[PDB]
From a paper:
KRAS mutations are among the most frequent gain-of-function alterations found in patients with cancer and their therapeutic targeting has long been a key objective in precision oncology. The KRAS GTPase cycles between an active (GTP-bound) and an inactive (GDP-bound) state. Here we report the discovery and characterization of a non-covalent inhibitor that binds preferentially and with high affinity to the inactive state of KRAS while sparing NRAS and HRAS. The pan-KRAS inhibitor works by preferentially targeting the inactive state of KRAS to prevent its reactivation by nucleotide exchange.
We began by removing the covalent warhead from the G12C-selective inhibitor BI-0474 and applied structure-based design optimizations to obtain a potent non-covalent inhibitory activity. Although the removal of the covalent warhead (precursor 1) greatly reduced the potency of G12C inhibition, we were surprised to find that the warhead-free scaffold indiscriminately inhibited proliferation driven by the noted KRAS variants, albeit with a low potency (half-maximum inhibitory concentration (IC50) ≥ 1 µM). The crystal structure of precursor 1 in complex with wild-type (WT) KRAS showed that the piperazine moiety was suboptimally positioned between the carboxylates of E62 in the Switch II motif and D92 in the α3 helix of KRAS. Furthermore, we observed a highly coordinated water molecule near the C5 atom of the pyridine ring (3.6 Å). We thus proposed that the potency of precursor 1 could be enhanced by improving its interaction with E62 and by introducing an acceptor functionality at C5.
Residue numbers in the entry: 0 to 167
Write the structure that this text describes.
């Protein structure tokens, strides 16, 4: 049968979670997507010759640490932790999202990729070396993306699928 991979995109509001998700789903850059919409989107893709079914949860909204929301995020098999390279605060938030993933999955070994988005912009405030070194601290891959130009989009999602395959 065709394997389905539940991927969850997390990170601060405005970093480009929706734009990255829609680039993968539509193959089109959407510069405007209702920032409150949290939804899931499926796509059949060939990763390493294998046709598999991606189920991408594009998260949104305020913090909620209820049993219900925990249960919901627990369905995720792998996570993209997204920050924007021109927003220091979104990068400084990453450790929170990682800590909540570790908590709800009850594991130090959850498939995860650090994503530096908006790589097309000249307004960088987060050094690539700082981002690579944070991924190194966590033992996870780091991928530089632009939802605008599609730079790195497949790399980010496909790497996460590969991390899930390993973890199994
Ligand atoms: C960085 C912090 C703290 N900061 C002081 C204010 C802004 N902020 C925000 C603001 C909005 C959201 C979040 C947030 N945190 O985790 C989560 C996610 C979705 C990640 C995946 C695992 C779990 S499990 C659970 N119940 C979650 C929930 N909700 C989460 N979303 N965090
Ligand atoms: N230049 C540029 N703008 C982006 C990129 N990704 C998202 N944006 C913009 O960043 C803002 C927030 O994007 P959005 O997808 O809503 O972020 P979300 O809140 O994380 O879902 C919008 O103004 C988008 O047009 C990117 O890679 N490059
Ligand atoms: Mg969004």
């Amino acid at each position: 049968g065709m394997t389905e991979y539940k991927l969850v995109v997390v990170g601060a509001g405005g970093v480009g979670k929706s734009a990255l998700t829609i680039q993968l789903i539509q193959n089109h850059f959407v510069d405007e997507y209702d920032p409150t919409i949290e939804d899931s989107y499926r796509k059949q893709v060939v990763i390493d010759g294998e046709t598999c079914l991606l189920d991408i949860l594009d998260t949104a909204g305020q913090e909620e640490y209820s049993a219900m929301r925990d249960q919901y995020m627990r369905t995720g098999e792998g996570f993209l932790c997204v920050f924007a390279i021109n927003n220091t605060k979104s990068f400084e938030d990453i450790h929170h999202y990682r800590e909540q993933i570790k908590r709800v999955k009850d594991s130090e070994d959850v498939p995860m990729v650090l994503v530096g988005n908006k790589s097309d912009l000249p307004s960088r405030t987060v050094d690539t070396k700082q981002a690579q070194d944070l991924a190194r601290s966590y033992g996870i891959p780091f991928i530089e993306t632009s939802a605008k130009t599609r730079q790195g989009v497949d790399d980010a999602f496909y790497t996460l699928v590969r991390e899930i395959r390993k973890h199994k």
